[PDB]
């Protein structure tokens, strides 16, 4: 099914509403831009455009097995493309080119001309489309990357749908109908047009603000399959979620609220309602985020109650927060705040709360019980049932509950209300009444002969939520039978007394003369909110369990709290999908069943660890108590003093990173190279398994001393006679291992990825010292695949990237960064820890299964959707699963297994504007093995003076070592020991293979015993190869004889256009025979499988040839290499319109083609003029015309060396021929079939 | 290095013949390994010429002396003189030498011989 | 075609001389000659490493040069050891003549 969909784009001005450069009030006016889109190809007829579409994302539906083709036409200014994503292209749109310097190859990106279509002709197959245990339709997005300002001015993003057929066998008609649903931002300040600011930033969903955006709908109760998509490239970020319905999925049920800033999520809603559906925001302010929404109708088609009466009852109980006072000490400036002054109230608030209660006294207030407060009532009940609830207000002022995931609510008596009010909202609690709710739990709370186990829903009330927060009403909800009593789970519940009408009795409770303050000050409302965790700090919550129960884990939260929170329990890992993780992130609204288990105990001093909590003095101290050799491992830090770049950014910046070390004592690093690049600027890259400690002896040399935390640190109850903490701190020239066994339970199920992939911190100082450098990466796998010693497993790659953000405010080397012998320079980021463009060392096996570990920490703008351009990546679920969807997430890390089929640089993207104005592109790069040639030196391609050394002599020549040449001067002979020749490749290529012969001079058989290779990039950063693991130091085993040549390659390849041999070991002279084996990235130079002679022989045609009675001199006869009588080829006669057609069946750019002569008679054969054709349908002729004589190389130095037609420009159509016009002797011509079969 | 070491006898008689050779200790040696040479004091190598040069091959300008068969090949170094012809031609102080390839200690050992006359 | 010979035979001078033994050679060869030292009733050993690096450790008497065709031998300390026989060879395969031999007399 052939696609012919077309695109376009335009500026329009429109400020959404109907139906210089100055604010100007009511609605304003801007001009905005979207795309449009004409079906027929006319340009000029459109359809009438509806009041709902705006900037709604235009679809683009797929099936598998079927070709698609998409245009675009230039209707704006500056030449723009298209990027996809998870789609297999070559090149054609990238729009990010690299150190090369060289003609067009893919430089029309950034160049449109007035008009052009520039398809792009996608490819949809079996590994680009979902299987059968996949989801039905999975789902994917483009947006335009070439330009940076335009698009975050534009911000025009697109959708796309993959998967396969089923609209020709009987499907439901619910499908497509054009409905998705997107997010932008408008921004036109740096516009073409352009124009003291007075601008703000502000959002807009689908293209329609101030309720110009239709699209709510209500219809029957049909499994829609509608997915929702957004993405945010902008700092700062806005408060949406949705009320209708849940997101269900399968057969097993998740209640997930899942709107979050940045989403790419492949789901589907159940419309069971009819009627209206709403979307709020958390926003004060009503002018912005104004998209309220009424309803639009349309028809889209055409277990028994038992006695659990509970008593829930409300009343306020003041409670001081901080009990414990720790003012004394003014240790790290915590003091300023706890003075008198301005602002400095107290701690005493009184607020009416709700909790329940058994007993109805009520004549005064009577002191509840410790660690039982503050928490909401446990409400237990069953589908259908009856239960009054006792409700009052201490205070006047109006307090109301309002159920949530109940729908079944009708009117009490009668159906309407004659009252001025006919809906629940707001309906008048006086405080003392009495007033129940009429409950009814829905009839999918119990499956089809499976009744569930468990299950976690929770309500709280919504309908005053602008003033319910100020009172802290929440209300846990247990729903489920005996397969608890301790109850202490922890909460979140920031006390908002800005709000809160009992600050204004406050005011003169406790302030007589508030003449001081003002009370229009905003610094005392910013400060008078403060953050509290359940209620309880300074060493006030504990918490205790111990093995065999039948009882669950149980945690809840409630609140978006603005920012995200980092919470968890070093020690126990909790299992949270059937994935073993620590550190798990707070988002709100989530709810899952879980269990720990009680196993070791240990008292370590934490708190909360979020980045801007835990200063309060808060512990949450946990306190859980009872109711073969091995591998030596170290880890070292060190600072290096390297500012990354003057030109295209004295300044001067030392990092102090997390290394690996050989022995206690400072003498050799063990350093390594390829296989072990993960280093950079990151921390150490361990391989452990099971049952070996790491006694890592951490000790610095630095200049000052630190700490170090494992962040797994298992040890028992030591440190005896009291529990006194671990100081911790390590100081420079100490013995101090830092040692733990594995644990066997943290190994997933054999079906499943067997390796799973932790991290560790420094807990002293994560925004002080961790921040400055100090991070560092953990590996730990199961089972034993890496056999031997050194693990020689070629099975799987596997590096590890992260994210964070540097400042230079962080590190401790301000002042001193003048080696101690406009304010643009504040803001700095921090990408793998090097910019420009140029950390290279990811490389990978073409056509191999390759497992991933993605890894990001930091602060919240460190963690955004990344992944490597153009590939497709998934993870096994018990089951063969293919879906593309994962992100970065602070903490949770798993296992990804992906296998790219095809060759090439590639991109990482950057959804963040901070970061890709920061000029990041940690490419990376893959090869072919098959290649075997050699690359400009053993044929002579470089110039002579390019090679340089130390020391010449006369009638003596280095440059003779080629292959297969001796004969008296075959080396260089110098009487110091080593030596050093450099040749340059031109360009960065691919390295495969090194091969080396001995020379004779005299009556020796001169050779190189022993070697190693070196090379650089720019002669400013040296490194070696020091892969292939089998020990740090590898010597390279030469020649045993002169006639020894063979064959070797290497497991990690080498990049680099520069190479430097150190013959340290010599055959008693200092000889130097070097042949240079390599190769490009394409790998196009070998034979097409032609060497067959049983291949046809009518697949090869031509004008015409030696055709005579003894008509046996074909044109394929004349191989290369090949023995034989008279085995060249001849023309009919001597004419030039005889050319060499091959087989195409395919377009193919050109890139090499040689010619050899023929070794009859012994007699020397050249040519001096020769052209080169070019055509598509035998009319016309255009070749690479320039500066006027057509480019011409010259061949043939003798009748035996061949030479190749290198064709690096592009010599298009799908014919190419030769046509020899300088001849010898007599005609006769060889061959050899070059490229490859691709694009 | 390698040291030679010499195996067989010198006095020579009418009437009989026998083998002359020279070994080493350790085969450190080429395939062009070969070469024969006596003194001669103020004079040639053997008495006005070279026993032979080319590397491996018996001859000079004419007589192409072929008679001089090789047993066996590679890392040994012998030939035979004819004892029953020469005989005051085959009289003086032998050295058992070959120019070494490596040239670290030093580049020529010799043999020692001894005082040789015709049986009277 | 190298054709040497070896000049002189024989000398006799007074104290504190320094003079150079040279050979004709016929057409262009290598500086690598050979020369060796046989006073009489020694083995003939080479004391110059390739005549043209003085071999480390050997006294300053010996001192070789030359190349192309002409080779020089300057001596810095005269001794009346001057009974040695010394020998002009290349080291070549094509047909090549060595020196004569220069064994000095002594006077009474």
């Known amino acids: 099914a052939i696609r012919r969909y077309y695109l376009g784009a335009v500026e329009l001005s429109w400020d959404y509403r109907q139906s210089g450069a100055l604010p100007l009030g009511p609605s304003v006016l801007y001009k905005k831009t979207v795309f449009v889109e004409f079906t027929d190809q006319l340009f000029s007829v459109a359809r009438p455009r509806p009041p709902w579409m705006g900037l709604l994302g235009p679809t683009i539906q797929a099936e598998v097995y079927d070709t698609v083709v998409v245009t675009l036409k230039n209707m704006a200014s500056h030449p723009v493309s298209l990027h996809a994503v998870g789609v297999s292209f070559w090149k054609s749109s990238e729009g990010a080119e690299y150190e090369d310097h060289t003609s067009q190859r893919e430089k029309e990106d950034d160049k449109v001309l007035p008009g052009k279509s520039q398809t792009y002709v996608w490819q949809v197959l079996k590994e680009n489309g979902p299987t059968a245990s996949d989801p039905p339709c999975l789902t994917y997005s483009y947006l335009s990357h070439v330009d940076l300002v335009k698009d975050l001015n534009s911000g025009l993003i697109g959708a796309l749908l993959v998967c396969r057929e089923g609209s020709l066998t009987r499907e439901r008609t619910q499908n497509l109908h054009e409905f998705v649903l997107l997010f932008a931002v408008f921004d036109e300040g740096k516009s073409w047009h352009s124009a003291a600011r007075a601008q703000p930033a502000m959002h807009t969903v689908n293209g329609y603000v101030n309720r110009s955006l239709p699209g709510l709908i209500g219809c029957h109760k049909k499994s829609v399959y509608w997915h929702v998509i957004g993405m945010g490239t902008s700092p700062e970020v806005h408060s949406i979620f949705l009320e209708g319905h849940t997101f269900l999925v399968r057969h097993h049920r998740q209640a997930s609220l899942e709107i979050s800033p940045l989403t790419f999520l492949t789901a589907q809603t159940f419309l069971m309602d009819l009627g209206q559906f709403l979307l709020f925001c958390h926003i004060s302010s009503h002018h912005h985020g104004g998209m309220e929404a009424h309803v639009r109708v349309e028809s889209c088609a055409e277990k028994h109650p038992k006695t659990w009466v509970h008593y829930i009852a409300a009343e306020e109980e003041d409670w001081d927060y901080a009990p414990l006072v720790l003012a004394p000490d003014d240790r790290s400036y915590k003091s300023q705040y706890l003075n008198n002054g301005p602002q400095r109230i107290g701690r005493k608030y009184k607020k009416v709360r709700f909790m329940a209660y058994t007993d109805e006294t009520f004549k005064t207030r009577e002191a509840i019980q410790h660690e039982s407060g503050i928490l909401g009532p446990l409400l237990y009940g069953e589908v259908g049932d009856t239960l009054l609830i006792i409700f009052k207000n201490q205070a006047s002022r109006p307090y109301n509950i309002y159920p949530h995931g109940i729908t079944d609510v009708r009117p009490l008596y009668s159906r309407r209300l004659p009252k001025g009010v006919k809906h629940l909202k707001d309906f008048p609690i006086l405080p003392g009444e009495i007033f129940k709710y009429k409950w009814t739990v829905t009839v999918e709370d119990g499956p089809t002969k499976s009744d569930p186990r468990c299950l976690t829903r929770y309500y709280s009330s919504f309908v005053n939520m602008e003033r319910d927060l100020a009172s802290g009403l929440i209300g846990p909800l247990l729903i489920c039978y005996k397969e608890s009593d301790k109850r202490n789970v922890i909460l979140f519940s920031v006390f908002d007394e800005n709000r809160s009408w009992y600050l204004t009795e406050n005011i003169q409770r406790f302030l007589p003369n508030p003449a001081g303050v003002q009370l229009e000050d905003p610094e005392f409302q910013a400060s008078n909110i403060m953050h509290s965790i359940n209620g309880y700090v300074f060493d006030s919550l504990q918490l205790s369990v111990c093995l065999h129960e039948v009882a669950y884990w149980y945690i809840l939260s409630i609140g978006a709290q603005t920012d995200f929170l980092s919470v968890f329990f070093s020690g126990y890992t909790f299992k949270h999908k059937m994935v073993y993780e620590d550190t798990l992130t707070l988002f709100p609204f989530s709810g899952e069943t879980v269990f720990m288990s009680m196993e070791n105990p240990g008292l370590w001093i934490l708190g909360c660890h979020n980045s801007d909590f835990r200063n309060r003095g808060m512990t949450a101290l946990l306190k859980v108590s009872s109711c073969k050799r091995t591998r030596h491992y170290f880890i070292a830090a060190v600072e290096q003093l390297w500012d990354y770049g003057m030109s295209e950014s004295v300044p001067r910046f030392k990092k102090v990173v997390f290394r690996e070390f050989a022995d206690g004592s400072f003498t050799q690093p063990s350093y390594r190279g390829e296989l072990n690049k993960h280093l950079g600027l990151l921390g150490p890259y361990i391989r452990a398994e099971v049952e070996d400690n790491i006694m890592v002896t951490f000790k610095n040399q630095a200049s000052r001393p630190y700490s170090f935390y494992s962040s797994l640190i298992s040890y028992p109850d030591d440190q005896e006679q009291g529990a006194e903490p671990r100081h911790n701190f390590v100081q420079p020239n100490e013995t101090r291992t830092y040692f733990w066994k594995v644990q066997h339970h943290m190994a997933p199920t054999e079906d499943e990825f067997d390796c799973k992939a932790w991290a560790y911190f420094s807990d002293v100082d994560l925004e002080k010292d961790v921040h400055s450098g100090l991070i560092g990466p953990l590996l730990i796998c199961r089972a034993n695949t890496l056999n031997a010693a050194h693990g020689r497993q070629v099975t799987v790659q596997e590096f590890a990237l992260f994210f964070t953000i540097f400042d230079e405010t962080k590190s401790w080397y301000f002042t001193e960064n003048v080696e101690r012998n406009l304010k643009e320079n504040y803001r700095f980021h921090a990408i793998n820890g090097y910019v420009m463009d140029t950390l290279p060392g990811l490389v990978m096996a073409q056509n191999q299964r390759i497992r991933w570990y993605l890894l990001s920490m930091g602060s919240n703008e460190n963690i955004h959707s990344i992944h490597f351009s153009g590939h497709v990546f998934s993870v096994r679920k018990k089951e063969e699963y293919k879906m593309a969807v994962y992100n970065l997430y602070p903490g949770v890390f798993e296992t990804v297994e992906m296998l790219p089929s095809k060759v090439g640089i590639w991109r990482i993207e950057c959804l963040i504007g901070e970061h890709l104005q920061a000029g990041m592109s940690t490419t990376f790069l893959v090869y072919s093995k098959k290649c075997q040639t050699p690359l400009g030196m053993a044929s002579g391609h470089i110039r002579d003076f390019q090679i340089t050394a130390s020391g010449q002599y006369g009638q003596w020549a280095p440059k003779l070592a080629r292959l297969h040449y001796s004969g008296s001067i075959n080396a260089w002979s110098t009487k110091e020991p080593f030596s050093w020749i450099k040749v340059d490749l031109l360009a960065p290529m691919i390295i495969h293979g090194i091969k080396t012969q001995g020379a004779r001079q005299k009556f020796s058989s001169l050779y190189i015993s022993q070697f190693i290779i070196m090379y650089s990039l720019d002669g400013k950063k040296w490194q070696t190869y020091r892969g292939n693991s089998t020990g740090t130091l590898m010597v390279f085993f030469g020649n045993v004889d002169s006639s020894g040549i063979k064959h070797n390659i290497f497991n990690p390849p080498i990049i680099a256009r520069y190479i430097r041999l150190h013959p340290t070991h010599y055959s008693i002279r200092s000889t130097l025979r070097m042949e240079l084996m390599g190769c490009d990235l394409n790998s196009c130079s070998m034979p097409l499988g032609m060497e067959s002679k049983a291949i046809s022989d009518a697949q090869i045609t031509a004008s015409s040839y030696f055709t005579n009675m003894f008509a046996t001199w074909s044109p394929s006869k004349a191989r290369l290499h090949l023995q034989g009588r008279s085995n060249a080829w001849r023309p009919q006669v001597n004419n030039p319109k005889e050319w060499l057609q091959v087989d195409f069946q395919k377009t193919m750019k050109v890139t090499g083609v040689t010619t050899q002569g023929v070794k009859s008679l012994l007699t020397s054969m050249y040519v001096k003029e020769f052209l080169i054709s070019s055509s598509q349908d035998g009319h016309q002729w255009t070749l690479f015309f320039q500066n006027g004589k057509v480019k011409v190389f010259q061949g043939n130095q003798d009748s035996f060396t061949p030479v190749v037609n290198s064709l690096d420009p592009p010599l298009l159509t799908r014919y190419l021929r030769i046509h020899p016009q300088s001849w010898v002797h007599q005609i006769a011509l060889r061959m050899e079939v070059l490229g490859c079969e691709a694009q | 290095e390698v040291q030679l070491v010499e195996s067989g006898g010198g006095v020579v008689q009418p009437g009989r013949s026998l083998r002359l050779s020279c070994v080493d200790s350790?085969?450190?040696?080429?395939?062009?390994?070969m070469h024969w040479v006596r003194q001669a004091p103020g004079a040639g190598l053997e008495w006005v010429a070279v026993?032979?040069?080319?590397?491996?091959?018996?001859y000079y300008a004419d007589s192409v002396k072929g008679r001089f068969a090789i047993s066996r090949d590679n890392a040994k170094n012998t030939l035979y003189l004819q004892m029953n012809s020469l005989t005051i031609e085959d009289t003086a102080v032998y050295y058992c030498?070959?120019?070494?390839?490596?040239?670290?200690?030093?580049?020529?050992?010799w043999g020692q011989g001894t005082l040789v006359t015709v049986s009277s | 075609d190298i054709q040497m010979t070896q000049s002189p035979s024989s000398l006799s001078a007074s104290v504190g001389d320094t003079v150079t033994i040279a050979c004709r050679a016929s057409?262009?060869?290598?500086?690598?000659l050979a020369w060796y030292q046989q006073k009489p009733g020694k083995a003939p050993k080479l004391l110059i490493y390739?005549?043209?690096r003085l071999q480390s450790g050997v006294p300053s008497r010996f001192s070789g040069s030359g190349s192309f065709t002409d080779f020089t031998l300057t001596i810095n300390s005269l001794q009346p050891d001057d009974s040695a026989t010394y020998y002009c060879?290349?080291?070549?395969?094509?047909?090549?003549?060595f020196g004569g031999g220069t064994k000095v007399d002594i006077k009474g």
């Open positions: 030498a070959k120019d070494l390839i490596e040239s670290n200690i030093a580049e020529a050992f």
């Open positions: 350790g085969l450190t040696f080429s395939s062009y390994g």
């Open positions: 026993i032979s040069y080319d590397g491996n091959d018996k």
């Open positions: 057409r262009d060869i290598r500086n690598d």
């Open positions: 390739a005549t043209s």
């Open positions: 060879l290349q080291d070549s395969d094509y047909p090549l003549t």
